[PDB]
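Students often ask why we bother predicting the structure of a whole assembly rather than each chain alone. The short answer is interfaces. A chain on its own may look different once its partners are present, and contacts between molecules only exist in the joint model. In this exercise we take six input lines together and write out one structure for the complete complex. Read the inputs first and try to guess which parts will touch.
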Amino acid sequence: VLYVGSKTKEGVVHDVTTVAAATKEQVTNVGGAVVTGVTAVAQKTVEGAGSIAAATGFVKKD
Amino acid sequence: VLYVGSKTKEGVVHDVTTVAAATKEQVTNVGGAVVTGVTAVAQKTVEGAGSIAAATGFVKKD
Amino acid sequence: VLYVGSKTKEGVVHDVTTVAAATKEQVTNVGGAVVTGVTAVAQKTVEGAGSIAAATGFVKKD
Amino acid sequence: VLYVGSKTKEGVVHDVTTVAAATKEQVTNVGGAVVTGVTAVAQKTVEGAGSIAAATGFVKKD
Amino acid sequence: VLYVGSKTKEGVVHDVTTVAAATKEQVTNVGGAVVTGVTAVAQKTVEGAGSIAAATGFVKKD
Amino acid sequence: VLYVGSKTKEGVVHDVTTVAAATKEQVTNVGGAVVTGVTAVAQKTVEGAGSIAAATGFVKKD
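Now the answer. The structure tokens for the assembled complex follow.
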């Protein structure tokens, strides 16, 4: 292996923009999850049994 | 293997734009999940039994 | 292995922008989670059984 | 005017590649010009009388 | 005018690659110019009479 | 005018790579110019009469 003048990108997020304006919002939540905003996860490795990687608004009522 | 002047991208998200405006919103949630916003997951590897990678608004009522 | 004049990026988030304006918001939460803001996770490795890496608004009612 | 999450490119050159190999070359030059290599000019504005912008192998024997 | 999360590029050169190999070369030059290598010019503005912007191997025998 | 989370690039050169190998070269020069190597000019403004901006291997035998 050998890289010359190169570039690598494994697991990236970029140039995420968000322009809200004049935003009203009501959220009545009970017990569950509410997610009303920008999100971004950047991981290289996740291993192992039962793994729950990069959840969002997760509810596990086992 | 050898890369010269190259570029790699494994598992990426980019140039995500979002222009809301004059947005009213009501959300009455009970028990379950609600997801009302931009999202982006960037992973390279996920392994193992039972794995639940990059969920969103997940509800596991086992 | 050998890199010359190169660049690597494993598990990164960048150039995350967020322009709110004139934002009203009410959130009545009981028991569950509410996430109403920008987020970003940057990890290289996560291992092991049962692992729950990079949750958000997680609720585990086991 | 207003740009959101945009990109502009005025007068650009990019991704110029060149793979020579086992190249012999003789060049006997007298008085004139010889150009035997990759070239690229990037300008936004050039004005004025008599202007000679981005010449290559130019010979002006006025 | 107003840019949000944007990008501009006026007069740029990039990602110029050059891979020579096993290259013999003889150049016998007298009086004139010889240019046997990668080149790149990046300007935004050039004004005025008689201007000679970004020449290469130029010979002005006025 | 106003930029938010933005990026500008006026007159730039970047990511210039050059991989020579096993290169023999003879250059017998008399009076004129010889240019056998990578080059890059980065200017924002050049003004005025008679201007000669970013020459290379120039020979002015007026």
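Check your guess against this: Chain E is about 0% helix and 35% strand.
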